[PDB]
Amino acid sequence: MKASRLYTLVLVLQPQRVLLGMKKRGFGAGRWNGFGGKVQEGETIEDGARRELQEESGLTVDALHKVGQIVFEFVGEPELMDVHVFCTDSIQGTPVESDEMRPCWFQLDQIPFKDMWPDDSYWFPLLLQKKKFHGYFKFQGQDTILDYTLREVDTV
Ligand SMILES: Nc1[nH]c(=O)nc2c1ncn2[C@H]1C[C@H](O)[C@@H](COP(=O)(O)OP(=O)(O)OP(=O)(O)O)O1
Ligand code: NA
Ligand code: NA
């Protein structure tokens, strides 16, 4: 069995658009993603997701709703990424560009799947339908899925 590290991912999803962030620097630059990062000691997962949304995008929110959980496994990495996925309830403020991330709105008929993590093509349609999900994806590198599971659930 493997150890897992906790991460968050937040989708700012409105009726006609979604906010994504383009990673600007380092390895993995050029891909659009939700907002999030590692959970820290002592905070709840939801509070970590709110904190990461603010640090990464400048947006604050009073509350999130949990919509999914996805485990990522990468060839050559023994540690699993356990990603807890949330959708915003309502947002305050404007998103802000940083040196690491550029936020941008996309209409929901222009979701930029080819420039997102490949797994998003599978689970983000469920998120758009207001369904909840559990997933697992094993990657070779950044682009190639070797194995995956995806299941709609009634409780995350
Ligand atoms: N396959 C994938 N599909 C996806 O949609 N999001 C993914 C993904 N793999 C990783 N992510 C997201 C999860 C999380 O929001 C982020 C990874 O977190 P990071 O390692 O950037 O966290 P931190 O910024 O806290 O890390 P530090 O560099 O230690 O500060 O990318
Ligand atoms: Na962090
Ligand atoms: Na991050």
Author numbering: 1 to 156
The authors write:
In the nucleotide pool, which is more susceptible to oxidation by reactive oxygen species than DNA, human MutT homolog 1 (hMTH1, human NUDT1) is the most prominent mammalian enzyme among other enzymes responsible for sanitization of the nucleotide pool. hMTH1 is characterized by broad substrate specificity as compared with Escherichia coli MutT; that is, hMTH1 hydrolyzes different oxidized nucleotides such as 8-oxo-dGTP, 2-oxo-dATP, and 8-oxo-dATP with almost the same efficiency, whereas MutT shows high substrate specificity for 8-oxoguanine nucleotides. Accordingly, hMTH1 prevents mutations and cell dysfunction by its hydrolytic activity toward both 2-oxo-dATP and 8-oxo-dGTP. Here, we carried out structural and kinetic analyses of hMTH1 and demonstrated that hMTH1 shows broad substrate specificity for 8-oxo-dGTP and 2-oxo-dATP because of the exchange of the protonation state at Asp-119 and Asp-120 depending on the substrate.
Here, we report the crystal structures of hMTH1 at neutral pH in complex with the major substrates, 8-oxo-dGTP and 2-oxo-dATP, at 1.21- and 1.20-Å resolution, respectively, using our hMTH1(G2K) mutant (it contains a homogeneous N terminus), which produces a new crystal form while retaining the hydrolytic activity. In the 2-oxo-dATP complex, on the other hand, 2-oxoadenine (2-oxoA) is recognized with a different hydrogen bonding pattern from that around 8-oxoG: the 2-oxoA base is recognized via two hydrogen bonds with Asp-119 and a single hydrogen bond with Asn-33 and Asp-120, respectively. The O2 atom of 2-oxoA, which is the characteristic feature of 2-oxoA, is recognized via a single hydrogen bond with Asp-120 (distance 2.6 Å). In addition, Asp-119 forms two hydrogen bonds with N1 and N6 (both distances 2.8 Å) of 2-oxoA. The side chain of Asn-33 shows two conformations, but the major conformation forms a single hydrogen bond (distance 3.0 Å) with N3 of the base. Accordingly, the position of 2-oxoA is shifted toward Asp-119 by the two hydrogen bonds with Asp-119 as compared with the position of 8-oxoG in the 8-oxo-dGTP complex where Asp-119 forms a single hydrogen bond with 8-oxoG. On the other hand, Phe-27 in the 2-oxo-dATP complex is far away from the 2-oxoA base, and the electron densities of L-A including Phe-27 are less obvious than those in the 8-oxo-dGTP complex, i.e. L-A in the 2-oxo-dATP complex is more flexible. The binding mode of the triphosphate moiety of 2-oxo-dATP is basically similar to that of 8-oxo-dGTP despite the difference in the coordination of Na+ ions and the loss of interaction with Lys-23. As the results, in the case of the 2-oxo-dATP complex, the bond length analysis showed that both Asp residues were deprotonated. We could not judge whether the result was true or not, because our X-ray data with low 81.9% completeness and 1.4 I/σI value in the outer shell were not satisfied with the criteria required for the bond length analysis method.
